[PDB]
Amino acid sequence: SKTVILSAARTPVGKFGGSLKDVKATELGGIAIKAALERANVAASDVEEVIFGTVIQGGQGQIPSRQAARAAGIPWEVQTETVNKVCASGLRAVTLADQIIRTGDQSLIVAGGMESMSNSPYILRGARWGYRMGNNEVIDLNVADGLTCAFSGTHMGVYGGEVAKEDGISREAQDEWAYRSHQRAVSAHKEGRFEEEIVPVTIPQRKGDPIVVAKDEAPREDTTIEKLAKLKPVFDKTATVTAGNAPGLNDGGAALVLMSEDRAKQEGRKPLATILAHTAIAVESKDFPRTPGYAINALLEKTGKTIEDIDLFEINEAFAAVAIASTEIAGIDPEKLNVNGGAVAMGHPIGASGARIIVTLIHALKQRGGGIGIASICSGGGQGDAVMIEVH
Amino acid sequence: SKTVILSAARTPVGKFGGSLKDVKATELGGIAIKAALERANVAASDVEEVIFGTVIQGGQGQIPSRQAARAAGIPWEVQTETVNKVCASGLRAVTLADQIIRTGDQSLIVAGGMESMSNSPYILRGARWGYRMGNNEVIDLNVADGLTCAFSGTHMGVYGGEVAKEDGISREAQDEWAYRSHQRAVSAHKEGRFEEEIVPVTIPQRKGDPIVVAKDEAPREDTTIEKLAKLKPVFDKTATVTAGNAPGLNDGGAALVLMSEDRAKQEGRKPLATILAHTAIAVESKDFPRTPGYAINALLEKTGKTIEDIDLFEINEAFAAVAIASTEIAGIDPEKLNVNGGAVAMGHPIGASGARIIVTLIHALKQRGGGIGIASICSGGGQGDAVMIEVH
Amino acid sequence: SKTVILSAARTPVGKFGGSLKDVKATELGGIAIKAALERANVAASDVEEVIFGTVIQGGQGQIPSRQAARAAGIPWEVQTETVNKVCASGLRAVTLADQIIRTGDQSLIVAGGMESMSNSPYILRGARWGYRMGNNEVIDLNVADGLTCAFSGTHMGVYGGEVAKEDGISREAQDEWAYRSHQRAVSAHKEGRFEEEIVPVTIPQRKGDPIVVAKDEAPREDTTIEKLAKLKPVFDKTATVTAGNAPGLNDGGAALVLMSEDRAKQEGRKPLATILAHTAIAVESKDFPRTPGYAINALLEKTGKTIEDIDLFEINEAFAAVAIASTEIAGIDPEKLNVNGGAVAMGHPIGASGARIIVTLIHALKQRGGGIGIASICSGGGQGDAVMIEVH
Amino acid sequence: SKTVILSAARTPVGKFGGSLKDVKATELGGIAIKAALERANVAASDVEEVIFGTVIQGGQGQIPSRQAARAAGIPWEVQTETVNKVCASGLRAVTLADQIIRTGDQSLIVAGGMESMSNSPYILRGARWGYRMGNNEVIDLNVADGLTCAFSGTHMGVYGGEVAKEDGISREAQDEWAYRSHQRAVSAHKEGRFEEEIVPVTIPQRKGDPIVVAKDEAPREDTTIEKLAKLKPVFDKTATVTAGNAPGLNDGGAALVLMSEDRAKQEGRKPLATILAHTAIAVESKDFPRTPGYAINALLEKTGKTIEDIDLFEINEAFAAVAIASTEIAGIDPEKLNVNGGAVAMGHPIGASGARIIVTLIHALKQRGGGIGIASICSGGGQGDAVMIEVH
């Protein structure tokens, strides 16, 4: 009747063309799943279902979730499906696992998300039946399937900047949040607050010692307000959104081991956390950046809780302006938001981020002596999802 | 509270480059969803979730389930996700909807699947970071993401012929099943047995009046054993699988409206069917054609039923050899299998087929005065899914 | 000290994607060369040099002239080079052969041109070193290398329409010339005036009798002023140039056998024609359509002849407006211009047209009892070439 | 009236993806032409014709010779054509200019060649009319149009290794020649023997000051027999040709200013060289590496000279084995061959090399107090061209 989280692991997040560029999305998923199973002390052969999110499926091959499962050493006999809720994919994987466990149909599920935006292909839409004559387009699949609205063709970053302008969020407020996101991510790394959650990625090397990637690539200790203030708007000349106050494109994987509260008791397992509730809302595509505060308010109404009952928040930083506006919409103390840093500093590997923020939330709550947390994420197409957890 | 099915609708299935070539997958999904809502007498704004399957997501744009929902006239405020379980996607959308309704989290869900194999793009894996020198491959995304194993690169048709050979299923038995599949589909079309389930597709033209597609394109009244016996093996020169005794590539959409049994009773609705139970199994990728008989045997074990308790079966005809072998494994009377024809005749629009066979099963049971049916489908990667329904 | 033409042959001209679509440019060249050698009664092994024009060389393979030579049965021991003077390529092949013969370095040369605009590839300019991110272009090589200015990117048809507007050539005058070009080409075919020059193309057929293409595909007996007047401008909304009063894209080959006047006497050969003189001029790229009248005036000044000394003209119909304006610039009786039709009706297979108009000129002069002719052609990049011949 | 050479200039040769990667072929041609005009003290507006070679024309835009002419500051009013004789293109441009000047038709021509193998595109042969289904090839245009036989598809390097084997030229002899080619090119650069012929390329930067490229990139002072002997065969596992004893792919331009002997005397010019004679031969495509010795023997027969009458030779080093074998066939003293290095060290920018070896021969003769030289080059498709010059 309730689902517990036994474990939660994430790869470091790599920059576009960076540290993880030679690692497939399914291999990043595999690494995070394998670490999650080891930390849970759960046998790969006892997993009943693998539910995994990824957005840019084109060119990843049949059922990417199954490739991630096999790369983790989960046997062929374990069922799986791949889910796509754009930026929310990795979080909806976890909330679907919760719903299936709650039916009693399964009691042990691996859920999470992966993305290698470095490795997305280019596509040709007219090569099958023929262009016949005239120049046409060769299409960046990250842009076509992940970063632009299927209805308007408008970049997600244009919508982020339109919402910041309508919310009255200044360029300077966005840059101050970007600075604090970097400084919190850098401090979290240096002070050992990401050592527990991260599973390093080992990349075999011809020349000698393998490359071990153990640190988030994108956070910068030398970030300053003065440097951020010099950047030009990146999606729209009239706007306040820059390369500095919004995440770029990234690579990463994250995974959680979920079990029914009953089975966990029977096996003498101490859960990392309990899933208390989740909810999702949907709006027009252009309003997607507004959804995290709305999803939190809906989840508080559903659970009969208020904002003061929550110890920590993770709101995925799709734009600095989203963190800022969600604060005002939900009445959140910013000191309780994204306390180890967020996507502006860390990156937004879109199919992974929903799972990545839950991994981060669990460890941040544990670091602060446990309590109630909410993870909330907006997604392309106009959705918002939120999950409430208790860390003991 | 069990889940009931209020309505079930499908487009006609088109041939590759055929009658539905100018229609997007998401538009075929929209047409099926809108027909299912009208037949259920359900307002589009009362839908609480859309769960939709599609396999070749590359180039379809952000979250294709959302595109299909909007094309049906479902408002922005309705949540959605896109699921990928290769050939089983459209059936897993339905069984996930059943699981979510059984939690009480939602009471009214649209589920189904879509595919436009005619409109899948070509991809370039090296165009992003450069080929540097030497010739390389321009890749058919139906082949890369749908029709070849992610682990070996082997075509699904090679695995179908390998299993047919190991099962001792002759070329002649496969051609006989292919012939009966065509005769049954042609007879169903001619005798009015697909009129109820089909929603015609209207295609506006660059010239005069719109073209109305109201019939499955692939079944052939002129099918003969003589022609089938002359065809060459298509996937492997030593093998028994041909273009005639296996489906080719296809386009189509299918959708069902699901409601809690309690909400249906509350609104005074007469359900079209009840979902009794479902299960899934998984094996090594190369064994995928063996799964439908095993999924059926597992589902009977789970429900404490025997093969004699089931009135009709729909086993997706991934190969004629899968229908034949599944019959032996589950002990099925072939007169109760695919009685209005199956994929060898009708086609295999991969992300839609799992929903399409449920739509067909429901109507085939209604045509015999109701009863208990099982729909079972194998999928790329080595999975098998089965659902048991009751039609009143 | 003078060059004679022993023979002159051309394939029919095919429409884009039409009758010759399955024939490579080098095979069209081969067919025209082989016919020219047969009609000259010259052994393939006695040819000393092959000079062949083609504009869209990309994807044709190493030295296309050598492929055409070998397809004609000319042995490996015969030297060759491929020339590119855009639309003038096939004519400059012949005038270069004249210059080489005049040195005494060679005495027997095959010259002409070929083009298969049906078979030109598409290209990717960034796939080698990588697009990195963002959408880019897949490029029609006919557009990039043949039909647009290398300096401005402007289509040749935009320049044609700007020159017609500045010369004061009406839409109605252009349509009247297009009508007369069609009616003259249709009459030439029906009345046997193209039977001598054409070598049919034989395309082998699985099903039975081969396809023999023996007729120019594009001329239309049902062309009318009323039909032409309804077309919309095709390169530029403000312009008078349409799909009807300018050639499209085409396929074809043409070839001439050239010999020194001395060797022809020694071998007892009756030349078809003598090359008297040639010249070329160059202007800015946008003024290319002006050049044919200027080239004719320069060739008359060079030879001490006047317009009344010339019996027949061939001016390649790059636009109907070019034929009309060249008439006024050179003082030409239109009754002596393009008398068997021209490119508006027949097509413009760009690397062949310069050779094709010389083939046509020779046979038209022969039909009218011999005399002096000039062939003149404008070319992309701003050039004009003219050659004066005598048919005995 | 013979033809004289007033000036001869080349860019440095760049490595594939190296120092000249950001410079178009036509810009390298322009730089060489402008330097040749300045060194000849010839006004750009007095040039009467530009004959320029380039092999990978695909994607370079209309008539690349015209682009190179305009980039040099030659006015629109100067006629031009682009020539393709594969590897011999830049040399055939020069010998065609000689032939045209010998007619008296023109008295002042710029000739030469260019190639940017770094910037050649990739092509799609089926994108126009459609792939329909199945994977296909994205094609490197350097491979398709420059480096493979149009008839067999076999790499030029397979033919070079086949001829080396049949000629009995050991792996060790080829590596010894490779070593001497590097030592000679390095010594020529260090001792000032390329300062006169090179025109540096200035490349404006997206950052600070322009980069000046003034040295050939490919020669290596660190070349050893030890390293050469460890390399694996590159084109064929049984063969003796490696990445070390054959040139790779390269970028460069070269240009010469040619004038009638009579006009040079009239203007009181001191010619840099006189063209005495040239000839060409042709063989089967697979025999192309055998041609330079045969072209030399034919040119000696034509001029009534013997090998003892020639002071220096430039034989383009298509393979080290071609230099060695050509030496045996013509009876050349190797101390008189490629004395400032050759293509194994310097690179093989295919459409420029034939002009580049003439530029180098002229300067190498001037450095030894003048005399008679022969430049000889083999080319893809089975040709060999040789020109004899006298430097005063």
Side-chain angles (χ1 to χ4, degrees):
Chain A
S1 166
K2 282 222 157 72
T3 305
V4 303
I5 300 166
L6 299 183
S7 70
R10 70 174 186 87
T11 73
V13 179
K15 297 183 75 175
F16 184 75
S19 62
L20 306 175
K21 82 153 321 211
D22 295 321
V23 189
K24 299 197 316 188
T26 49
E27 296 174 325
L28 294 173
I31 289 164
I33 290 167
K34 182 178 182 150
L37 286 169
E38 291 174 333
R39 297 172 182 185
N41 191 37
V42 163
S45 62
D46 282 334
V47 178
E48 296 173 323
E49 188 162 0
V50 176
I51 312 178
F52 236 66
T54 188
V55 183
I56 314 293
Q57 293 180 19
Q60 290 201 51
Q62 281 184 336
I63 191 176
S65 61
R66 187 132 172 104
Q67 296 179 59
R70 285 297 304 138
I74 299 177
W76 293 113
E77 290 82 15
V78 181
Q79 71 184 265
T80 183
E81 54 273 318
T82 308
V83 301
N84 182 354
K85 198 177 177 177
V86 202
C87 329
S89 297
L91 183 147
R92 191 58 180 123
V94 168
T95 67
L96 280 167
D98 169 72
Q99 293 177 304
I100 292 165
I101 286 164
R102 283 165 53 226
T103 69
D105 292 355
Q106 310 296 345
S107 58
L108 173 48
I109 301 188
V110 164
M114 54 197 175
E115 207 79 55
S116 178
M117 297 180 86
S118 291
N119 290 308
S120 304
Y122 274 75
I123 76 169
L124 295 167
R125 299 189 191 282
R128 181 178 304 281
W129 302 111
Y131 290 111
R132 186 157 194 282
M133 79 169 51
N135 295 348
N136 210 292
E137 284 199 287
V138 62
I139 291 156
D140 179 336
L141 209 54
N142 289 319
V143 169
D145 287 349
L147 304 174
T148 60
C149 181
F151 303 94
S152 62
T154 300
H155 198 291
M156 296 302 103
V158 170
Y159 294 150
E162 291 170 347
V163 169
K165 172 148 44 62
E166 299 259 56
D167 287 340
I169 304 157
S170 61
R171 168 61 175 280
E172 298 73 22
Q174 291 172 66
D175 287 351
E176 291 160 22
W177 191 275
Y179 172 85
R180 73 93 82 176
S181 179
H182 279 271
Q183 290 310 334
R184 289 174 170 268
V186 170
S187 171
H189 165 69
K190 285 186 174 313
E191 293 174 1
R193 290 197 292 288
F194 285 150
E195 199 178 344
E196 195 173 9
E197 72 197 62
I198 288 178
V199 47
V201 177
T202 305
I203 311 177
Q205 290 297 106
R206 165 164 180 102
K207 288 186 146 74
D209 293 342
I211 306 174
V212 190
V213 180
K215 177 186 177 177
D216 296 306
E217 190 182 2
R220 283 202 75 105
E221 196 173 5
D222 69 4
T223 300
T224 72
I225 298 292
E226 176 223 74
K227 276 186 262 201
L228 287 165
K230 296 181 165 180
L231 299 175
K232 278 164 169 213
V234 288
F235 302 112
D236 171 352
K237 295 204 135 59
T238 74
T240 57
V241 170
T242 74
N245 66 27
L249 283 71
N250 296 92
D251 302 331
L256 294 83
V257 174
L258 275 50
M259 191 178 268
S260 69
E261 185 176 50
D262 287 353
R263 180 169 175 179
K265 287 185 181 176
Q266 286 182 168
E267 294 190 5
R269 306 178 97 112
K270 298 306 195 189
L272 201 49
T274 301
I275 298 173
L276 299 187
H278 45 85
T279 209
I281 59 95
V283 294
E284 66 188 325
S285 187
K286 69 152 191 76
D287 284 332
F288 94 93
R290 307 184 194 272
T291 64
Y294 302 170
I296 288 163
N297 286 348
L299 183 56
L300 292 172
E301 181 151 12
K302 167 180 177 162
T303 55
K305 288 196 187 308
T306 59
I307 205 75
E308 21 284 317
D309 295 316
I310 317 302
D311 299 305
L312 280 187
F313 296 84
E314 282 285 318
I315 299 174
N316 191 54
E317 299 176 350
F319 307 89
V322 165
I324 292 160
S326 292
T327 292
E328 293 167 16
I329 290 165
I332 294 162
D333 178 0
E335 291 301 307
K336 304 187 196 298
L337 180 57
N338 304 349
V339 299
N340 290 342
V344 170
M346 294 170 74
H348 183 19
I350 64 180
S353 284
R356 202 281 300 159
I357 65 172
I358 303 171
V359 175
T360 296
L361 176 65
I362 285 166
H363 286 88
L365 279 169
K366 182 182 94 85
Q367 287 161 12
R368 307 280 190 102
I372 307 300
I374 296 174
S376 187
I377 191 160
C378 60
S379 55
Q383 302 197 86
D385 293 64
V387 60
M388 181 184 293
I389 61 165
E390 184 163 25
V391 172
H392 319 272
Chain B
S1 187
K2 289 221 165 51
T3 307
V4 296
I5 302 170
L6 301 183
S7 65
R10 65 179 186 85
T11 73
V13 179
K15 294 186 70 185
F16 184 72
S19 61
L20 301 177
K21 173 185 180 313
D22 298 319
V23 190
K24 291 180 9 164
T26 51
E27 300 168 327
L28 297 173
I31 291 167
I33 291 163
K34 179 186 191 132
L37 288 175
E38 287 170 344
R39 298 175 186 186
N41 193 18
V42 167
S45 64
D46 287 331
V47 177
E48 294 176 317
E49 189 163 356
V50 177
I51 312 173
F52 236 67
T54 188
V55 181
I56 315 299
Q57 296 181 21
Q60 292 196 228
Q62 278 186 340
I63 188 173
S65 63
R66 191 145 173 89
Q67 295 181 59
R70 287 300 297 140
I74 300 175
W76 292 112
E77 294 78 18
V78 179
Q79 65 184 265
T80 186
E81 52 272 319
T82 308
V83 299
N84 181 358
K85 196 177 180 183
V86 203
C87 326
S89 298
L91 183 142
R92 187 61 179 124
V94 172
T95 66
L96 277 173
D98 171 69
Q99 290 173 310
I100 293 163
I101 289 163
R102 283 162 50 223
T103 69
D105 295 353
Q106 306 300 344
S107 64
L108 177 51
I109 299 185
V110 167
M114 58 194 172
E115 208 77 58
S116 177
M117 297 180 85
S118 296
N119 288 308
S120 303
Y122 275 73
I123 76 164
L124 293 168
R125 296 187 193 287
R128 183 178 303 281
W129 301 113
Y131 290 113
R132 182 164 201 279
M133 76 175 325
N135 298 346
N136 214 294
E137 289 202 285
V138 63
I139 293 156
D140 178 340
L141 203 53
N142 288 320
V143 169
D145 286 350
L147 303 171
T148 60
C149 178
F151 303 95
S152 64
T154 298
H155 198 292
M156 293 303 96
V158 168
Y159 292 158
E162 282 175 350
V163 168
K165 184 194 322 274
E166 303 266 50
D167 284 342
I169 302 182
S170 65
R171 171 60 176 275
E172 297 72 25
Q174 291 174 63
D175 287 354
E176 292 167 24
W177 192 275
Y179 175 91
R180 75 87 86 172
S181 184
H182 281 271
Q183 294 216 318
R184 281 172 178 276
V186 167
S187 167
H189 162 68
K190 282 175 149 28
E191 298 180 0
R193 290 196 294 279
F194 289 146
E195 205 161 295
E196 184 167 20
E197 67 199 66
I198 284 171
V199 48
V201 175
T202 307
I203 311 179
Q205 297 296 288
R206 298 305 311 286
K207 269 166 270 213
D209 298 298
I211 298 171
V212 179
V213 177
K215 179 168 86 161
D216 303 302
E217 192 182 1
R220 288 189 78 84
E221 202 181 350
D222 70 357
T223 303
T224 64
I225 298 296
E226 287 83 359
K227 175 207 194 152
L228 290 169
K230 298 243 166 214
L231 295 179
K232 292 173 213 214
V234 66
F235 301 114
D236 171 349
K237 298 180 86 204
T238 55
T240 61
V241 173
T242 70
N245 57 35
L249 282 71
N250 296 91
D251 304 328
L256 293 82
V257 174
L258 274 53
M259 184 178 277
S260 66
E261 184 175 49
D262 299 335
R263 185 169 169 173
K265 286 171 169 188
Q266 292 174 173
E267 295 192 358
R269 290 177 186 268
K270 306 300 195 206
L272 183 50
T274 300
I275 301 174
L276 298 184
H278 52 81
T279 202
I281 64 164
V283 296
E284 190 181 358
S285 185
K286 72 144 183 88
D287 287 331
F288 90 95
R290 308 186 196 263
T291 67
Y294 308 160
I296 289 167
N297 291 346
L299 182 53
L300 290 176
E301 170 82 6
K302 177 179 168 174
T303 54
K305 289 182 160 21
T306 64
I307 205 73
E308 305 100 288
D309 299 319
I310 314 301
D311 293 306
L312 290 177
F313 302 82
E314 280 293 314
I315 300 173
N316 193 50
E317 297 179 346
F319 307 91
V322 164
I324 294 166
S326 288
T327 289
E328 318 255 20
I329 285 155
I332 295 167
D333 177 351
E335 292 299 310
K336 295 180 191 275
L337 179 59
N338 301 352
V339 296
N340 287 341
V344 170
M346 297 176 65
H348 184 20
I350 59 174
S353 284
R356 202 287 296 158
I357 62 168
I358 300 173
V359 170
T360 297
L361 178 61
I362 286 164
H363 291 85
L365 283 162
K366 165 168 173 172
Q367 290 159 191
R368 82 167 284 287
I372 294 172
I374 294 175
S376 188
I377 188 161
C378 62
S379 58
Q383 302 198 88
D385 289 73
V387 59
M388 181 182 293
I389 66 174
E390 181 157 44
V391 170
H392 339 93
Chain C
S1 166
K2 282 222 157 72
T3 305
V4 303
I5 300 166
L6 299 183
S7 70
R10 70 174 186 87
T11 73
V13 179
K15 297 183 75 175
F16 184 75
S19 62
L20 306 175
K21 82 153 321 211
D22 295 321
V23 189
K24 299 197 316 188
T26 49
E27 296 174 325
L28 294 173
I31 289 164
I33 290 167
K34 182 178 182 150
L37 286 169
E38 291 174 333
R39 297 172 182 185
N41 191 37
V42 163
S45 62
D46 282 334
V47 178
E48 296 173 323
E49 188 162 0
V50 176
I51 312 178
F52 236 66
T54 188
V55 183
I56 314 293
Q57 293 180 19
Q60 290 201 51
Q62 281 184 336
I63 191 176
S65 61
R66 187 132 172 104
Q67 296 179 59
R70 285 297 304 138
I74 299 177
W76 293 113
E77 290 82 15
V78 181
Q79 71 184 265
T80 183
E81 54 273 318
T82 308
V83 301
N84 182 354
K85 198 177 177 177
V86 202
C87 329
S89 297
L91 183 147
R92 191 58 180 123
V94 168
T95 67
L96 280 167
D98 169 72
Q99 293 177 304
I100 292 165
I101 286 164
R102 283 165 53 226
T103 69
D105 292 355
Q106 310 296 345
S107 58
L108 173 48
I109 301 188
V110 164
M114 54 197 175
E115 207 79 55
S116 178
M117 297 180 86
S118 291
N119 290 308
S120 304
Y122 274 75
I123 76 169
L124 295 167
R125 299 189 191 282
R128 181 178 304 281
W129 302 111
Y131 290 111
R132 186 157 194 282
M133 79 169 51
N135 295 348
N136 210 292
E137 284 199 287
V138 62
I139 291 156
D140 179 336
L141 209 54
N142 289 319
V143 169
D145 287 349
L147 304 174
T148 60
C149 181
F151 303 94
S152 62
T154 300
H155 198 291
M156 296 302 103
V158 170
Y159 294 150
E162 291 170 347
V163 169
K165 172 148 44 62
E166 299 259 56
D167 287 340
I169 304 157
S170 61
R171 168 61 175 280
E172 298 73 22
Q174 291 172 66
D175 287 351
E176 291 160 22
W177 191 275
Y179 172 85
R180 73 93 82 176
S181 179
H182 279 271
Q183 290 310 334
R184 289 174 170 268
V186 170
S187 171
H189 165 69
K190 285 186 174 313
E191 293 174 1
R193 290 197 292 288
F194 285 150
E195 199 178 344
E196 195 173 9
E197 72 197 62
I198 288 178
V199 47
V201 177
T202 305
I203 311 177
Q205 290 297 106
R206 165 164 180 102
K207 288 186 146 74
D209 293 342
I211 306 174
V212 190
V213 180
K215 177 186 177 177
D216 296 306
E217 190 182 2
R220 283 202 75 105
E221 196 173 5
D222 69 4
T223 300
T224 72
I225 298 292
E226 176 223 74
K227 276 186 262 201
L228 287 165
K230 296 181 165 180
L231 299 175
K232 278 164 169 213
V234 288
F235 302 112
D236 171 352
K237 295 204 135 59
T238 74
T240 57
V241 170
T242 74
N245 66 27
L249 283 71
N250 296 92
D251 302 331
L256 294 83
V257 174
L258 275 50
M259 191 178 268
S260 69
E261 185 176 50
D262 287 353
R263 180 169 175 179
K265 287 185 181 176
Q266 286 182 168
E267 294 190 5
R269 306 178 97 112
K270 298 306 195 189
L272 201 49
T274 301
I275 298 173
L276 299 187
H278 45 85
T279 209
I281 59 95
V283 294
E284 66 188 325
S285 187
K286 69 152 191 76
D287 284 332
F288 94 93
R290 307 184 194 272
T291 64
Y294 302 170
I296 288 163
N297 286 349
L299 183 56
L300 292 172
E301 181 151 12
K302 167 180 177 162
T303 55
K305 288 196 187 308
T306 59
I307 205 75
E308 21 284 317
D309 295 316
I310 317 302
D311 299 305
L312 280 186
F313 296 84
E314 282 285 318
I315 299 174
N316 191 54
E317 299 176 350
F319 307 89
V322 165
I324 292 160
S326 292
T327 292
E328 293 167 16
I329 290 165
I332 294 162
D333 178 0
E335 291 301 307
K336 304 187 196 298
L337 180 57
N338 304 349
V339 299
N340 290 342
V344 170
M346 294 170 74
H348 183 19
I350 64 180
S353 284
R356 202 281 300 159
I357 65 172
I358 303 171
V359 175
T360 296
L361 176 65
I362 285 166
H363 286 88
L365 279 169
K366 182 182 94 85
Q367 287 161 12
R368 307 280 190 102
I372 307 300
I374 296 174
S376 187
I377 191 160
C378 60
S379 55
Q383 302 197 86
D385 293 64
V387 60
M388 181 184 293
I389 61 165
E390 184 163 25
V391 172
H392 319 272
Chain D
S1 187
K2 289 221 165 51
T3 307
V4 296
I5 302 170
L6 301 183
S7 65
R10 65 179 186 85
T11 73
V13 179
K15 294 186 70 185
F16 184 72
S19 61
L20 301 177
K21 173 185 180 313
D22 298 319
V23 190
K24 291 180 9 164
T26 51
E27 300 168 327
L28 297 173
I31 291 167
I33 291 163
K34 179 186 191 132
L37 288 175
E38 287 170 344
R39 298 175 186 186
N41 193 18
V42 167
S45 64
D46 287 331
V47 177
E48 294 176 317
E49 189 163 356
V50 177
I51 312 173
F52 236 67
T54 188
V55 181
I56 315 299
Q57 296 181 21
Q60 292 196 228
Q62 278 186 340
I63 188 173
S65 63
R66 191 145 173 89
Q67 295 181 59
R70 287 300 297 140
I74 300 175
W76 292 112
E77 294 78 18
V78 179
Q79 65 184 265
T80 186
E81 52 272 319
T82 308
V83 299
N84 181 358
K85 196 177 180 183
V86 203
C87 326
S89 298
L91 183 142
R92 187 61 179 124
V94 172
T95 66
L96 277 173
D98 171 69
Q99 290 173 310
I100 293 163
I101 289 163
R102 283 162 50 223
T103 69
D105 295 353
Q106 306 300 344
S107 64
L108 177 51
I109 299 185
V110 167
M114 58 194 172
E115 208 77 58
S116 177
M117 297 180 85
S118 296
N119 288 308
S120 303
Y122 275 73
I123 76 164
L124 293 168
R125 296 187 193 287
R128 183 178 303 281
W129 301 113
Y131 290 113
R132 182 164 201 279
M133 76 175 325
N135 298 346
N136 214 294
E137 289 202 285
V138 63
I139 293 156
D140 178 340
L141 203 53
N142 288 320
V143 169
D145 286 350
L147 303 171
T148 60
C149 178
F151 303 95
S152 64
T154 298
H155 198 292
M156 293 303 96
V158 168
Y159 292 158
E162 282 175 350
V163 168
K165 184 194 322 274
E166 303 266 50
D167 284 342
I169 302 182
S170 65
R171 171 60 176 275
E172 297 72 25
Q174 291 174 63
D175 287 354
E176 292 167 24
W177 192 275
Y179 175 91
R180 75 87 86 172
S181 184
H182 281 271
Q183 294 216 318
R184 281 172 178 276
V186 167
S187 167
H189 162 68
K190 282 175 149 28
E191 298 180 0
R193 290 196 294 279
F194 289 146
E195 205 161 295
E196 184 167 20
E197 67 199 66
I198 284 171
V199 48
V201 175
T202 307
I203 311 179
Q205 297 296 288
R206 298 305 311 286
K207 269 166 270 213
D209 298 298
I211 298 171
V212 179
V213 177
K215 179 168 86 161
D216 303 302
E217 192 182 1
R220 288 189 78 84
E221 202 181 350
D222 70 357
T223 303
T224 64
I225 298 296
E226 287 83 359
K227 175 207 194 152
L228 290 169
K230 298 242 166 214
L231 295 179
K232 292 173 213 214
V234 66
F235 301 114
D236 171 349
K237 298 180 86 204
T238 55
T240 61
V241 173
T242 70
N245 57 35
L249 282 71
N250 296 91
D251 304 328
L256 293 82
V257 174
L258 274 53
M259 184 178 277
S260 66
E261 184 175 49
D262 299 335
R263 185 169 169 173
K265 286 171 169 188
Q266 292 174 173
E267 295 192 358
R269 290 177 186 268
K270 306 300 195 206
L272 183 50
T274 300
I275 301 174
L276 298 184
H278 52 81
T279 202
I281 64 164
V283 296
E284 190 181 358
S285 185
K286 72 144 183 88
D287 287 331
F288 90 95
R290 308 186 196 263
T291 67
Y294 308 160
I296 289 167
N297 291 346
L299 182 53
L300 290 176
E301 170 82 6
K302 177 179 168 174
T303 54
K305 289 182 160 21
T306 64
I307 205 73
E308 305 100 288
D309 299 319
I310 314 301
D311 293 306
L312 290 177
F313 302 82
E314 280 293 314
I315 300 173
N316 193 50
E317 297 179 346
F319 307 91
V322 164
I324 294 166
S326 288
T327 289
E328 318 255 20
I329 285 155
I332 295 167
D333 177 351
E335 292 299 310
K336 295 180 191 275
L337 179 59
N338 301 352
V339 296
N340 287 341
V344 170
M346 297 176 65
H348 184 20
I350 59 174
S353 284
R356 202 287 296 158
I357 62 168
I358 300 173
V359 170
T360 297
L361 178 61
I362 286 164
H363 291 85
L365 283 162
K366 165 168 173 172
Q367 290 159 191
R368 82 167 284 287
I372 294 172
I374 294 175
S376 188
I377 188 161
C378 62
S379 58
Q383 302 198 88
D385 289 73
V387 59
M388 181 182 293
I389 66 174
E390 181 157 44
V391 170
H392 339 93

